[PDB]
Amino acid sequence: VMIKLHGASISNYVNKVKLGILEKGLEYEQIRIAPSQEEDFLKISPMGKIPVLEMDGKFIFESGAILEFLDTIFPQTPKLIPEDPWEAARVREISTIIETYLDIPARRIYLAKVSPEIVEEVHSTLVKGIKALQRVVRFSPYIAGNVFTLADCSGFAHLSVLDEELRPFYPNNHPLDLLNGWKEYFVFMKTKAGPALVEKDKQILKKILARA
Amino acid sequence: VMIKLHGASISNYVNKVKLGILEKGLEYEQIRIAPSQEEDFLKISPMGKIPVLEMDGKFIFESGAILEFLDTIFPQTPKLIPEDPWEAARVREISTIIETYLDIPARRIYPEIVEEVHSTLVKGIKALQRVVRFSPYIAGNVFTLADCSGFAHLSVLDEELRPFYPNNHPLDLLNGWKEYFVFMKTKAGPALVEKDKQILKKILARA
Numbered sequence: 001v002m003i004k005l006h007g008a009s010i011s012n013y014v015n016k017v018k019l020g021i022l023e024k025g026l027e028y029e030q031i032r033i034a035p036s037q038e039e040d041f042l043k044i045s046p047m048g049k050i051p052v053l054e055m056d057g058k059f060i061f062e063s064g065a066i067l068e069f070l071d072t073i074f075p076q077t078p079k080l081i082p083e084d085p086w087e088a089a090r091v092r093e094i095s096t097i098i099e100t101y102l103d104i105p106a107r108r109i110y111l112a113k114v115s116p117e118i119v120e121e122v123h124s125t126l127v128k129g130i131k132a133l134q135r136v137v138r139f140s141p142y143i144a145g146n147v148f149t150l151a152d153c154s155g156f157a158h159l160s161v162l163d164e165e166l167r168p169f170y171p172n173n174h175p176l177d178l179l180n181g182w183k184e185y186f187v188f189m190k191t192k193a194g195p196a197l198v199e200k201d202k203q204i205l206k207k208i209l210a211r212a
Numbered sequence: 213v214m215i216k217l218h219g220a221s222i223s224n225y226v227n228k229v230k231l232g233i234l235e236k237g238l239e240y241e242q243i244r245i246a247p248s249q250e251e252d253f254l255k256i257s258p259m260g261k262i263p264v265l266e267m268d269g270k271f272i273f274e275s276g277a278i279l280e281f282l283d284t285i286f287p288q289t290p291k292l293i294p295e296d297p298w299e300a301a302r303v304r305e306i307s308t309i310i311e312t313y314l315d316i317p318a319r320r321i322y323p324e325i326v327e328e329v330h331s332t333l334v335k336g337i338k339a340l341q342r343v344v345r346f347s348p349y350i351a352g353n354v355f356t357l358a359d360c361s362g363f364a365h366l367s368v369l370d371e372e373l374r375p376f377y378p379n380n381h382p383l384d385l386l387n388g389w390k391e392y393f394v395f396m397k398t399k400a401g402p403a404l405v406e407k408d409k410q411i412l413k414k415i416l417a418r419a
């Protein structure tokens with residue numbers, strides 16, 4: 001098999017890549033591993049992170065570099081980076097906002113310390129990010145417009161997890177509730193085979209790990 | 213000219229963009245502003261950050277999206293993203309490591325967490341070592357987007373952390389860095405970027 005994706009289905013960054021692979025209809029195998037600082041893994045993934053893409057004996061790490069690479073070598077539909085450069089920028093903006101300004105903050109919670117205050121700081125930071133995000137998304141029906149893009153890979157993978165993770169922390173208080181279109185979008189994406197499969201694989205492994 | 217770069221030379225993310233604009237030989241004006249949460253600014257820059265690129269009455273924010281955009285509309289050498297797709301992945305990897313795994317953590321310093329931070333940086337520095345070539349540029353033999361992130365962020369990290377790790381500096385573990393820094397400073401673009409930063413620092417230099 002040409003493409004190997006290293007990383008388990010519970011990782012939202014793994015799932016971001018997986019969504020792009022599935023949507024293009026590429027053939028691949030997922031190799032379920034956990035992160036690790038063993039010298040052997042560091043050789044292919046310097047920070048000990050997943051996902052890692054393996055292809056042609058070469059390894060690419062970092063979900064963003066991976067998806068940009070796949071879109072370059074496998075330009076078949078959908079184009080994760082639109083050909084129009086302005087729309088490409090919007091796609092890249094959306095994805096950066098989601099990962100950098102929403103998920104990074106949220107990980108301080110759902111991954112440490114507990115403080116109503118700490119929790120409080122995060123609530124404010126997320127509300128700020130959500131409001132920024134609102135300005136660039138279209139959900140018509142995809143997050144950046146009328147076709148699947150990189151932004152849907154980041155959006156579906158991260159926001160689905162952010163949504164589940166933060167309900168415990170924020171009943172009546174969830175930041176996403178402020179993102180107009182999120183719920184419709186999430187339901188829409190779940191009517192699709194790729195996103196549905198990504199959710200299923202996550203659920204399968206979660207149920208299994210829970211029996212630790 | 214047809215391009216305006218919004219943000220002062222104090223910001224490493226602004227300097228990242230500036231390096232790429234300079235290296236492409238593009239006509240531009242730099243608008244010296246600070247970041248802001250003023251709604252009128254949030255309209256063109258949702259997170260209220262600098263830099264913001266403006267062209268054709270339209271705005272792009274996020275230094276990564278801006279340089280990928282300039283690469284695409286001004287595709288002439290130097291190509292910020294290599295034509296070879298593996299080399300292009302290397303470039304994006306280097307840039308992401310520098311920003312996410314070195315700069316972000318470093319920003320927790322500019323408490324006594326300075327020790328947990330020093331370990332994070334040695335780790336990030338050790339990972340970076342695995343992908344850089346410095347031959348002479350950060351990713352290889354030509355200027356790329358990774359040089360925009362590398363020169364903008366590393367220079368800052370180095371000076372900014374000397375007063376915290378006099379004999380302890382993690383960036384000293386990065387083989388080839390000092391020579392790269394020196395080499396980059398001989399080029400007209402990085403030299404201008406570095407001079408504007410230095411002027412601004414001498415100027416607002418009041419302890």
Ligand SMILES: N[C@@H](CCC(=O)N[C@@H](CS)C(=O)NCC(=O)O)C(=O)O
Nearest residue numbers: 011013035048049050051062063064
């Ligand atoms: N920026 C990285 C993030 C990857 C990441 O944080 N993955 C987690 C998912 S578990 C991980 O491998 N963590 C292990 C670690 O940080 O050591 C990417 O885009 O791939």
Ligand SMILES: N[C@@H](CCC(=O)N[C@@H](CS)C(=O)NCC(=O)O)C(=O)O
Nearest residue numbers: 223225247260261262263274275276
């Ligand atoms: N991810 C952004 C980072 C830009 C950034 O953090 N700029 C700083 C430089 S001062 C800023 O505008 N901070 C103001 C703020 O966060 O409100 C990028 O790559 O452009």
Ligand SMILES: [Cl-]
Nearest residue numbers: 008009032205
């Ligand atoms: Cl799995």
Ligand SMILES: [Cl-]
Nearest residue numbers: 220221222244
């Ligand atoms: Cl300035």
